[PDB]
Amino acid sequence: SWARELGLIRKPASFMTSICDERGQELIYAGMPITEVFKEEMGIGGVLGLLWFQKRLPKYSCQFIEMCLMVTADHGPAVSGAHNTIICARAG
Amino acid sequence: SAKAISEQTGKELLYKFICTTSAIQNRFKYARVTPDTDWARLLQDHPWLLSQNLVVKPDQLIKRRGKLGLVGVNLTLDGVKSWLKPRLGQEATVGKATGFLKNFLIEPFVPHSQAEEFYVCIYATREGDYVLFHHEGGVDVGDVDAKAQKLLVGVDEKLNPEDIKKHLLVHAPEDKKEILASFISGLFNFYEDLYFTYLEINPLVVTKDGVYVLDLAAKVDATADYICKVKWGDIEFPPPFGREAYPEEAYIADLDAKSGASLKLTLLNPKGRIWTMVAGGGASVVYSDTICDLGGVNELANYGEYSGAPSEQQTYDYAKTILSLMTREKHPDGKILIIGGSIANFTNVAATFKGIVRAIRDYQGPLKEHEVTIFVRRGGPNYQEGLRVMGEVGKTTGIPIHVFGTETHMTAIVGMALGHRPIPGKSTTLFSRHTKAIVWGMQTRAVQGMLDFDYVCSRDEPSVAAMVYPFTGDHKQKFYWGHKEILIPVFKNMADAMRKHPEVDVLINFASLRSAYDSTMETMNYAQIRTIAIIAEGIPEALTRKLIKKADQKGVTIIGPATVGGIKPGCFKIGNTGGMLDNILASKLYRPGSVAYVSRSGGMSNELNNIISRTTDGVYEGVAIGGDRYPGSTFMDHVLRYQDTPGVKMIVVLGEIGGTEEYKICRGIKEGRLTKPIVCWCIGTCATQASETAVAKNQALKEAGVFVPRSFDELGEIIQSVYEDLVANGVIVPAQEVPPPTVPMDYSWARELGLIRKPASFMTSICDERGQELIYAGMPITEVFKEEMGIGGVLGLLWFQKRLPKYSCQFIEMCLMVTADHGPAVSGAHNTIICARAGKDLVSSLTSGLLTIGDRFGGALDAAAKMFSKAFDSGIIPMEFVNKMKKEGKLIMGIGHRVKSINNPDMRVQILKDYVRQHFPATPLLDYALEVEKITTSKKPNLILNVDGLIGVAFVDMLRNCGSFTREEADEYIDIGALNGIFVLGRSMGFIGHYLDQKRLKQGLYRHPWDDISYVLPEHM
């Protein structure tokens, strides 16, 4: 930690992460800080465009992402995955 | 690498793979007699042997036996028996060489005349294949090259027989002109389908009866075996005829064969005082040349090398053999051991010196007894700590060891060892600062070294535009540019590499010795690639000549095979030339100089960079052409290239023994084409065509106007003398030294020599994966399998890190056999089936069913162990325990079966109960659980012990009451969850069985019908 602080050593980094700069003064998302996220009033479609695609999508596309996350919510407990969730929840 | 084969082997290969109209007689008619075999077996399997008249001659790679009269012709049984009696197995001499005669060949002798003997030969040259035919065969040659007809055939060119009869058959008898020529044509295909370099048949007897190949000789390309191992079968190369090898020499031979290192040792005078063990090939040749200059032609004990960074056991045994060989008998002028060497490219010098210091301290007694003095001189990455450890073992064990770094001359230390001095078309520019390369192959340390060099030489763009690796997709690899990280694209094909990067003009071919030719031929189908550097070693020479031919046709500058590359300082660096960046900064290779050089071996190029750094201004551009026989660009192709560039003022050439290449430099300096001051020196004297030697080329360049030193010791001195000549004439001005940019060093290299501590996480007291054996808990994998412990023993090793006693390993196998599948109706196997019928995966199905192992399903093992252990540890009677559980809700976990309980048992509680009764010392918690079973079966005819409760209490009974668990480890593993581990690892077999079953019955997706659901939703939310 000291030989790298005064910068006399090389260490190759893994985990290249082109998303979510967590350290510093703000949670920078794709390139947009968190206060700019809540200032432009982009919903979860805007942060899906920022996290998943790293692009500020236009406001008709964020609302379509929220629409297609509202229709692909629950579709009854008969289906195979919701059945497994219920079976695993009833085992407590 | 031409290696001469036995004439028995080449003669049987000629008998097997020739295809011609002329019938070869005596097909498969030969015998090999030797001292290791008898005589009756040869007559037993070859019944043709004593039917005719025979000729017997020694097959031990001996030239000129027909002129010297050492052949026994016209021999019957008495001739072939009493001829070998003064000959088979006795010591004899030919030329200089003295040794045994243990190999003799027996051929059916054919009487014939001297007007029927012919002479045919095919030898390889750089510009093609020469076939050479004299009508007068045998030993009566007369004139040799004048009346014998020659024909140069080109590479990748077909031999036309009309040019055979037109040009080569001038002095032939005409009736054999269809017998010989097509045969020769067939022989030419035999030369071209088996990759010979030299094949001379003399004499070839073309009688009226047919053709007879009595005597031949063949040097074959030993590196082409990957093409022709189906043709040669198991080829055998005989050693050149000489004395017998010591056991030490065969010991070093199997040390050489057993790894990727080069451990060469051949003793010269075993009672000698000056013993050499020196890293590098050219460095060994130069040290042997200099010690032969200083009167040690009888005092050099051996010539050898240790190269390719051997392991410290290999280094230890190699130095052990050389140290034991030099303590046999004392020599009164003192015995010297020279651990010399060139500058190491990337090897940590201190690790090889750990090998040396173990091999010296292990054999120190004979060293201080025989009064041995050790002279050590090395260079490279971290040489200074290695000189320090050699110095401390010099002062510690008392052996006088004189250590030296790169500040000294390389081979002047032997002058300090002997007391002679006291001890202290093709383009003319190849690389520019916009030269971009494409590397072929994942050779990331070479690309990182090139990027470090180009940061240090203040270059603005990295000279590796892309890499090419065919065995992976297109991605980008992260490299270091100074401090920063950049992304260099790695491609799959070369076509989209040349497409996306049109500024490339160099390709550096890091492919192997069998894929260099195809990638190089594919590369020259792109016009922008103007030079190709081929780092591979071991290409067959015919494929190299095809590469040279297509290079001259396309106009590219091939650096030649078996190179290390060639460094143009301040500008560009090919691969691993120069070495690690410590040698680049130590030799001032970050700014251009004025001296160019051309060498052959890569081991001498670092020494030449060191010499030109320490004596003169520095290297403008250096090129190592390759240690192969046909380099892609010779000496003249580079000194002509240094002629036209004005930045260079003087040229240094390091030539080698063999190959009339420096005579072309002599003719170029006599024709007035080479005007810049040349300093040539040719290595390889070895005087312990007669013009191809080192002293011949040295004298011929000395008389031609080229500065040639007396030895290698005066090479730096006269290079400094020519530099002082050239600056005093007022043309060489030394440029002003700007300091280079600095790179940070490495985390891998600073921790290797230990200069930066790092806190390690992930403490892992289990499974040392690295080393020779996969060491489980403290016990290797061979001790696991040899001691015959099942999977219960490896669960004791992985989970508990103890070697459990043999009755409890079988108990863990037992309780993993009963906690396997228990039907598919239960909740977890139901989830596995539901996920397997969705066609998912094995691991996703097992995992989706495994995530149910919780508290209600599968959580009776751990709870039924914890409950009974807390009741027993407290110390209450069972009748109070049942009443305590009744008073608080909380049904006793591990007690209760739905169907089978009393005189209708569970039948797998019974097997486990019989096992914990029989093979199992001192089991009190099971007895307590059986008393609680007595009470709760007195309550209800159900309520027998479960299998969950009995595995729980039997496992807690196994932990604390067998050995090796104290009381706080056996109580730790219950609270950690080592019983949930047994239920999950046991039930994993059942869940994978359910996955494979539902995947094998081809079952469709589940739906769980609506009539089993009863939706109870609110009215309007």
Ligand SMILES: CC(=O)SCCNC(=O)CCNC(=O)[C@H](O)C(C)(C)COP(=O)(O)OP(=O)(O)OC[C@H]1O[C@@H](n2cnc3c(N)ncnc32)[C@H](O)[C@@H]1OP(=O)(O)O
């Ligand atoms: C032909 C004809 O018509 S019949 C003639 C006349 N008919 C009659 O008289 C009717 C008789 N009625 C019966 O026989 C009924 O079976 C009954 C009412 C007595 C039920 O008796 P049971 O089944 O034994 O009681 P129950 O199911 O609650 O369990 C009994 C015990 O097991 C205990 N127990 C159950 N599970 C566990 C467990 N895992 N761990 C520890 N204890 C347990 C219970 O706590 C209970 O304990 P307790 O006796 O201290 O209260």
Ligand SMILES: O=C([O-])CC(=O)C(=O)O
């Ligand atoms: O790059 C090279 O060929 C040199 C090398 O690795 C070594 O010295 O072991």
Ligand SMILES: O=C([O-])CC(=O)C(=O)O
């Ligand atoms: O251990 C468990 O609770 C699961 C079990 O035996 C069962 O199939 O009923």
